[PDB]
Structures are given as C-alpha cells and as structure tokens.
C-alpha cells in the first residue's frame, strides 16, 4: 500500500466534473476545481488546469497527471510548513501517509489548525491523538474516511485499508 493507492481508495476516480461532499466542483481524484457555485467558473478552471478545452470531461491520464501534481504539492506544503514539518519528521512511514492524506483533503492551513492533535502525534500518544482527531467537523462530515485515517494514526499499519 502506498500514498497513491490510499488516496485513490478515499477519493475515487471520476472523469466528469462533479460535486464533492461539500458541494464543490471537482474532477478526477479529489482535484477541487472551485468553491464557486458556477458550473461555468468550474469549466473554465478545468481548461486552465488541463491546457485544453475539455468541456467538463477529461481522460484517465489527465486525471492521474493532476493527481501526481496534487500529492507532490501536498508533500512540499508539509515540508514548507513550520507547524507541519516537525510532525512529519517525527513520524514513521505509515503515519506520514496519514498526514499527507489529511493535507490533500483539507489543505495545509486546515491541518495546521488541529494544534492539540499535532502535539499529541508528535509525542506519540496514539490513542489520545485518535480520540482528539474525532472531535472535529471533519470526522462528523466524512466519518468513514476520517475513521480510516484515524486508525492509520492509532495503529501505524494499513489495516483500515485492507
């Protein structure tokens, strides 16, 4: 199991513009297009992103290209972030995947806001950090995915995904 297979399980693949769980315009593997209500604001963002006139539809290859950019952008953001970097460095390889998953989903700023949880992961107080992470809008909005991530942090294995 690797970060890519993990995010592919959590986000799915869709070759046509769609609305995310929050109601936003998305495409491919979790690639947020815009928070704007306009399908048109979305179609334009999409063509800017792909470099062609797509008319809301892309190929698998194109979805995977966007996915590779997003994962890379996610990793570089963590390593560039003064709150996230130290947590990441302190963690083992599996747990590192769990942090990248949250960042991809909620952005650097979002995750950086989970102050207490970050402090507990850094101290390797697993069960405690799992309990605190569950007290969030995130967990209440997408409980099945939150739980998977959270178990990954609690245990350090890929069990939730297997």
145 touching Cl ion, by CB under 5 A: yes
**CB 48, min distance to Cl ion, A:** 29
45 belongs to the catalytic site: no
Burial of 151 (0-12, 13-18, 19+ CB in 10 A): middle
Find the catalytic residue in 5, 10, 11, 159: 11
44 binds Cl ion (CB under 5 A): no
Residue ranges for the binding site for substrate?
A: 32, 104, 117, 132
Residue 142 interacts with Cl ion (CB under 5 A): yes or no: yes
Cα 95 to Cα 6, 61, 74, 146: the distances in Å are 12, 29, 15, 14
* Strands of 14-19's sheet in order across: 14-19, 25-28, 31-34
Q: Applying CB under 5 A, does 148 fall inside the site for Cl ion?
A: no
Contact (CB, 8 A) for 156 and 94: yes
Q: Give me the catalytic one of 5, 10, 20, 47.
A: 20
Q: Known catalytic residue: 20?
A: yes
User: Applying CB under 5 A, which residues contact Cl ion?
Assistant: 135, 142, 144-145
Enumerate the active-site residues.
11, 20
């Amino acid at each position: 199991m690797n970060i890519f297979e993990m995010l592919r399980i959590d986000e799915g693949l869709r070759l046509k513009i769609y609305k995310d769980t929050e109601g936003y315009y998305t495409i491919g593997i979790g690639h947020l297009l815009t928070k704007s209500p306009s399908l048109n604001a979305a179609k334009s963002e999409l063509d800017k992103a792909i470099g062609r006139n797509c008319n809301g539809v892309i190929t698998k290859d194109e979805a995977e290209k966007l996915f590779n950019q997003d994962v890379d952008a996610a990793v570089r953001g963590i390593l560039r972030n003064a709150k996230l970097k130290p947590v990441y460095d302190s963690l083992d390889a599996v747990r590192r995947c769990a942090l990248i998953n949250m960042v991809f989903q909620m952005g650097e700023t979002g995750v950086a806001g989970f102050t207490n949880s970050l402090r507990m992961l850094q101290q390797k107080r697993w069960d405690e950090a799992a309990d605190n992470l569950a007290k969030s809008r995130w967990y209440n909005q997408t409980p099945n995915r939150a739980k998977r991530v959270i178990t990954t942090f609690r245990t350090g294995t890929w069990d939730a995904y297997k």
